[PDB]
């Protein structure tokens, strides 16, 4: 009874985190009902020959092929389709040759050709190009060749069997793709777009909050969560960006997104934000340490550090705003030039010799923080140029 | 002809990088030949009822289940086995109930139970626990229930069909696992162990080379590769560590490794090395910059920075040596205490005021480098304690 309560509240939070998981769970069952009723009630005619010979394979296709995104099922469906076509042609050819050879060497020769192909294709599944794009196609290539060659049929039956396999894969895959595209779509390109703009938002949050909280019992643990967990969620999402980009390359043009859309540029901007998260991680550790400088030693540098941190935070905020609405923007340029002027003001402040009355270990912590902020300012200048190049590549609208 | 040359040399380098890919490609074809000859020649008797009714499903199982590691195929095989057992029992039960209800409502009630289960299981595939361990088991659960419920057989035939499905999954999976375990094994626990010791080695390489090359046309690009690519290979391997740990939790005890072996501690030590790679990344950027300090300004600090960097490099080297031979070691403690004494010597050197005749922008770069080295020294102290706790958890041998 107790673990029943735990699993129903776990289901409650999994559904509450994204409700499109509930709609995807209904779309899978709808595709199963649609495919099974097509092969049972047989609408236009009582099809025979290869049409209604096998119908468990259509349900196998729909269960395997359906996926949460649109590019995920389109990738699985197109891989399964072309692999079944090619391996079906090679399977009919293998049965022709092995029948032509002999009558008792025929199971021997067929199992040797299956050994050779499997070995050949299992080695090709370690190539990096085939690994990132078409690994499932090579698996279905092995599978379909070994189904057709190692069956116990003959020169007509094999032909019917190959056609049946090809036709039931096409019907199951097309039913999956039409329900995926036309009911409630979950585009992976929109999820990559939203994940990028959310990452910009969390970094802007830390920069403004560092501009305040650098110069100050459960509230300490609350702000500990609010600082640490956000940029630590940025660092652990290299893989999510990689996966959504591989899916979003498969999708058709929808809405605002053009047919050609630069997803590799999205992963490049994600990598630059991860470098900013490295520097933000270093700052956080120093902030949370126990060895803290006396506060007025920071208060003699409190002006241009506040200006640098706040203006780079506003630059990240304006870039996230311009990516959420897909426009070309020029607010980030003004907020970047202000941080550049603040860095030059700090460089003229440091020659004034205001740090000649300070212990050098405090100077170690102080010059670490100044170096981290200068690095983050130059990094946000790079991300501003890169987001501008992404905004011209995707042909964002020119409204502003 | 030209792309043929390109693909054969790509195959040459893919085989040369790891030759166990060639042996795995032979093991897959051997499992296909073994399974197909078992179902064709039918050794002990001409089995009937459920034994030789279906034999394409054994080859489907062997193609899908076989994987490069040992824990990978053991995970796929055990997931497929228990999912086929449970969904077979529920499928026979569903056909019993739907036959008991009516005679014309029976296809309607069967397709509604398939809709409910698919919806129920596709929602559970978003849980994080089920996602990291048993996602393929839930997929085979959907598949086997929908094969048994949506067939056109009746009260005896269904029973034979369920048993046949269960028996051919067990035979294909056991043939895969015995060839995987008993021919040439590729253990994923040994690959995680070797990947950890290699990561320690690349970090030790950078620390010694930084101790030399901090104080100095294609040779510049050569050492650019030799510095940059190593620690950048450390940073991009969070996922590899995660995947090999999930596989290595499935494996039986082999050789030196005990039945209980702490793979989560391996991923914890990998995370601490990734923090060291963050700090090493910051140092590299400064080293490669164009704004360089005049060299004698570094040469007045050249002594304890050399001692700190070299002793932490020797500590990483001794930890990698002790992890390659699986012993408990005490060389890392002496090499850590030397770096601690060097840090205190630097702290007494900085109070002497040798940095009062230097421009403060040069002091910014200098105090950045000193802060990075102090952070790396304290980090290697943490990794030394954590590798000691891993070395007692796994009960390494006490030879030294
Ligand atoms: Al015909
Ligand atoms: Al019987």
Three-state SS string across A327-371, please?
A: ECCCHHHHHHHHHHHHHHHHHHHHCCCCCCCCCHHHHHHHHHHHH
Contact status of B63 with chain A (Cβ, < 8 Å): yes
B213 CB-side CA count, 13 A: 16
* CB neighbours of residue A376 within 10 Å: 27
Q: Residue B386: in which H helix or E strand, if any?
A: helix B360-393
Helices B20-41 and B56-65 pack at an angle, to 10 degrees, of 160
Q: Check A56 against B122: CB less than 8 A apart.
A: no
Instruction: Give CA–CA dist B228/A300, Å, rounded.
Output: 38
Nearest by CB to residue A63, choosing from B14, B66, B146, is: B146
Handedness of CA A273, A275, A276, A278 (dihedral sign): positive
Q: Residue A233: in which H helix or E strand, if any?
A: helix A218-235
Is there a contact between B118 and A179 (Cβ–Cβ < 8 Å)?
no
Q: Check A60 against B147: CB less than 8 A apart.
A: yes
Q: Could you tell me which residues are beta bridge partners of residue A327?
A: A397
How far is the centre of ligand 1, averaged over its atoms, from the C-alpha of A292 (Å)? 83
In terms of Cβ atoms closer than 10 Å to its own Cβ (0-12, 13-18, 19+), residue B253 is exposed
Range list of H helices, A66-134: 71-101, 106-124, 128-132
Residue A252 per-residue DSSP state: P
Partners of A32 on chain B (C-beta within 8 Å) are 111, 114-115, 118, 146
Give strand ranges (E) for A194-333.
none
The vertex-A138 CA angle with A134 and A141, nearest 5°, equals 135
Taking CA atoms, B308 is separated from B234, B281, B369, in Å, by 22, 18, 12
In terms of Cβ atoms closer than 10 Å to its own Cβ (0-12, 13-18, 19+), residue A247 is buried
* Alpha-carbon gap: B325 to the closest alpha carbon of chain A (Å): 29
Closest CA to A25 of B36, B189, B127: B127
* Alpha-carbon gap: B247 to the closest alpha carbon of chain A (Å): 18
Instruction: Give CA–CA dist A85/A169, Å, rounded.
Output: 9
Range list of H helices, B102-217: 106-124, 128-132, 135-149, 157-182, 188-213
Instruction: Give CA–CA dist A86/A117, Å, rounded.
Output: 13
Instruction: Give CA–CA dist B210/B206, Å, rounded.
Output: 6
Instruction: Give CA–CA dist A303/A350, Å, rounded.
Output: 12
Instruction: Give CA–CA dist B296/A206, Å, rounded.
Output: 38
Instruction: Give CA–CA dist B252/B70, Å, rounded.
Output: 9
Rounded to 5 degrees, φ, ψ at B327 are -120, 160
Q: Helix (H, G, I), strand (E, B), or coil: what is residue A153?
A: coil
* Alpha-carbon gap: B347 to the closest alpha carbon of chain A (Å): 8
Partners of A238 on chain B (C-beta within 8 Å) are 236, 238-239
Contact residues for B315 (Cβ-Cβ < 8 A; gap 6+): B332, B335, B336, B339, B380, B384
Closest CA to B86 of B117, B108, B115: B117
Closest CA to B215 of B369, B353, B360: B369
Tokens of B370: 């000193």
Q: Check A30 against B139: CB less than 8 A apart.
A: no
Class of domain B188-393: mainly alpha
Is there a contact between B326 and B256 (Cβ–Cβ < 8 Å)?
yes
Q: How far apart are the first and last CA of chain B?
A: 57
Q: Could you tell me which residues are beta bridge partners of residue A2?
A: none
Q: Check B151 against A56: CB less than 8 A apart.
A: yes
Instruction: Give CA–CA dist B177/B70, Å, rounded.
Output: 8
The alpha carbon of A63 is separated from its chain's Cα centroid by a whole number of angstroms, namely 22
Q: Helix (H, G, I), strand (E, B), or coil: what is residue B140?
A: helix
Q: Helix (H, G, I), strand (E, B), or coil: what is residue B33?
A: helix
Partners of A365 on chain B (C-beta within 8 Å) are 371
Rounded to 5 degrees, φ, ψ at A214 are -75, -20
How far is the centre of ligand 1, averaged over its atoms, from the C-alpha of A160 (Å)? 5
Q: Could you tell me which residues are beta bridge partners of residue A397?
A: A327
Closest CA to B248 of B290, B196, B208, B318: B196
A259 CB-side CA count, 13 A: 0
Q: Which of residues 160-189 of A touch B (CB under 8 A)?
A: none
Handedness of CA B194, B200, B206, B211 (dihedral sign): negative
Q: Helix (H, G, I), strand (E, B), or coil: what is residue A186?
A: coil
* Alpha-carbon gap: A373 to the closest alpha carbon of chain B (Å): 12
Closest CA to B110 of B89, B100, B95, B92: B95
Q: How many helices (H) and strands (E) does chain A have?
A: 16, 0
* Alpha-carbon gap: B65 to the closest alpha carbon of chain A (Å): 11
Tokens of B268: 């914890």
Instruction: Give CA–CA dist A104/A107, Å, rounded.
Output: 7
In terms of Cβ atoms closer than 10 Å to its own Cβ (0-12, 13-18, 19+), residue A208 is middle
Partners of A361 on chain B (C-beta within 8 Å) are 347, 350
Is there a contact between A287 and A210 (Cβ–Cβ < 8 Å)?
yes
Tokens of B60: 């489907």
Long-range contacts of A22-26 (CB under 8 A, 24+ apart): A22/B123, A23/A183, A23/A184, A24/A68, A24/A184, A24/A186, A24/B122, A25/B119, A25/B120, A25/B122, A25/B123, A26/B119
Q: Could you tell me which residues are beta bridge partners of residue B397?
A: B327
Instruction: Give CA–CA dist B113/B148, Å, rounded.
Output: 12
Instruction: Give CA–CA dist B247/B263, Å, rounded.
Output: 10
Instruction: Give CA–CA dist B313/B210, Å, rounded.
Output: 10
Closest CA to B96 of B84, B82, B110, B85: B110
Q: Which position has the token pair 């039945």?
A: B259
Q: Could you tell me which residues are beta bridge partners of residue B327?
A: B397
Rounded to 5 degrees, φ, ψ at A173 are -70, -40
Q: Which position has the token pair 């934000």?
A: A273
Tokens of A179: 């329900």
Interface test with A, best of B63, B301, B356 (most A CBs within 10 A): B63
Contact status of B126 with chain A (Cβ, < 8 Å): yes
In terms of Cβ atoms closer than 10 Å to its own Cβ (0-12, 13-18, 19+), residue A185 is middle
Domain ranges for chain B, please list them: 2-182, 188-393
* Alpha-carbon gap: B160 to the closest alpha carbon of chain A (Å): 16
What chain A residue is nearest to B117 in terms of C-alpha separation?
Answer: A29
Is there a contact between A322 and A333 (Cβ–Cβ < 8 Å)?
no
Is there a contact between B119 and A28 (Cβ–Cβ < 8 Å)?
yes
Ligand nearest to the CA of B49: 2
Q: Which position has the token pair 């304890």?
A: B304
How far is the centre of ligand 1, averaged over its atoms, from the C-alpha of A54 (Å)? 13
Contact status of B354 with chain A (Cβ, < 8 Å): no
* Alpha-carbon gap: A186 to the closest alpha carbon of chain B (Å): 15
Q: Where is chain B discontinuous (C–N over 2.5 Å), named by the preceding residue?
A: 216
Helices A71-101 and A188-213 pack at an angle, to 10 degrees, of 140
Is there a contact between A308 and A380 (Cβ–Cβ < 8 Å)?
no
Contact residues for B290 (Cβ-Cβ < 8 A; gap 6+): none
* Alpha-carbon gap: B260 to the closest alpha carbon of chain A (Å): 27
Q: How many helices (H) and strands (E) does chain B have?
A: 16, 0
In terms of Cβ atoms closer than 10 Å to its own Cβ (0-12, 13-18, 19+), residue B201 is middle
Q: Check B119 against A363: CB less than 8 A apart.
A: no
Check residue B49 and give left, alpha or beta (phi > 0: left; psi -120 to 50: alpha): left
Instruction: Give CA–CA dist A212/A209, Å, rounded.
Output: 5
Q: Check B114 against A37: CB less than 8 A apart.
A: no
Is there a contact between A245 and A192 (Cβ–Cβ < 8 Å)?
yes
Contact status of A56 with chain B (Cβ, < 8 Å): yes
Taking CA atoms, B307 is separated from A119, B187, B304, in Å, by 53, 39, 5
B42-51: burial string, b at 16+ Cβ within 10 Å, e else: eeeeeeeebb
Contact status of B362 with chain A (Cβ, < 8 Å): no
Q: Check B14 against A59: CB less than 8 A apart.
A: no
Handedness of CA A246, A251, A256, A262 (dihedral sign): positive
Residue B153 per-residue DSSP state: -
Interface test with A, best of B119, B124, B285, B370 (most A CBs within 10 A): B119
Closest CA to A381 of A281, A276, A301: A276
Q: Where is chain A discontinuous (C–N over 2.5 Å), named by the preceding residue?
A: 216
Taking CA atoms, B156 is separated from B92, B145, B305, B394, in Å, by 10, 17, 81, 52
Rounded to 5 degrees, φ, ψ at B206 are -65, -35
How far is the centre of ligand 1, averaged over its atoms, from the C-alpha of A164 (Å)? 10
Closest CA to B171 of B277, B278, B53, B255: B53
The alpha carbon of B329 is separated from its chain's Cα centroid by a whole number of angstroms, namely 25
Partners of B24 on chain A (C-beta within 8 Å) are 122
How far is the centre of ligand 2, averaged over its atoms, from the C-alpha of B153 (Å)? 12
Tokens of B329: 């070691």
A73-90: burial string, b at 16+ Cβ within 10 Å, e else: bbbbbbbbbebbbebbeb
Q: Check A63 against B116: CB less than 8 A apart.
A: no
Partners of B15 on chain A (C-beta within 8 Å) are 123
């Amino acid at each position: 009874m107790e673990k029943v309560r735990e699993i129903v509240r776990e289901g409650i939070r999994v559904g509450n985190e994204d409700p499109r998981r509930i709609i995807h769970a209904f779309k899978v069952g709808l595709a199963l009902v649609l495919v099974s009723s097509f092969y049972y009630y047989q609408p236009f005619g009582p099809f025979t020959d290869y049409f209604g010979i096998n119908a468990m394979w259509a349900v196998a296709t729909v269960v395997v092929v359906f996926e949460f995104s649109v590019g995920a099922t389109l990738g699985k469906g197109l891989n399964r389709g072309v692999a079944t076509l090619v391996a079906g042609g090679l399977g009919i050819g293998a049965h022709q040759l092995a029948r032509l050879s002999g009558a008792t060497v025929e199971p021997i020769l067929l199992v040797m050709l299956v050994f050779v192909q499997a070995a050949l294709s299992t080695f090709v599944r370690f190539f990096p190009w085939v690994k990132t794009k078409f690994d499932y196609g090579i698996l279905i290539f092995i599978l379909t060749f070994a189904l057709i060659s190692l069956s116990g049929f003959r020169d007509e039956e094999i032909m019917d069997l190959a056609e049946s396999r090809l036709s039931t894969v096409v019907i199951g895959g097309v039913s999956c793709i039409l329900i995926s595209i036309f009911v409630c779509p979950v585009w992976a390109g929109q999820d990559l777009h939203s994940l990028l703009a959310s990452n910009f938002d969390t970094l802007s949050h830390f920069l403004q909050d560092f501009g305040d909280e650098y110069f100050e019992d459960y509230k300490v643990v609350e702000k500990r969560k609010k600082n640490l967990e956000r940029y630590k969620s940025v660092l652990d999402s290299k893989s999510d960006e990689e996966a959504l980009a591989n899916y979003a390359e498969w999708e058709p043009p929808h809405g605002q997104f053009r047919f050609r859309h630069p997803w590799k540029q999205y992963v490049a901007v994600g990598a630059l934000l991860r470098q900013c998260a490295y520097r933000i991680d270093a700052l956080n550790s120093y902030i949370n340490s126990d060895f803290q400088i006396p506060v007025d030693i920071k208060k003699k540098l409190e002006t241009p550090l506040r200006r640098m941190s706040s203006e780079s935070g506003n630059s990240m905020k304006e870039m996230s705003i311009s990516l959420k609405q897909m426009i070309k923007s020029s607010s980030s340029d003004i907020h970047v030039s202000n941080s550049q002027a603040a860095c030059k003001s700090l460089s003229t402040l440091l020659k004034s010799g205001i740090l000649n009355d300070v212990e050098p270990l405090q100077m170690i912590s102080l010059m670490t923080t100044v170096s981290m902020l200068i690095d983050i300012v130059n990094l946000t200048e790079k991300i501003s140029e890169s987001v501008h190049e992404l905004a011209s590549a995707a042909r964002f609208k020119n409204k502003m």
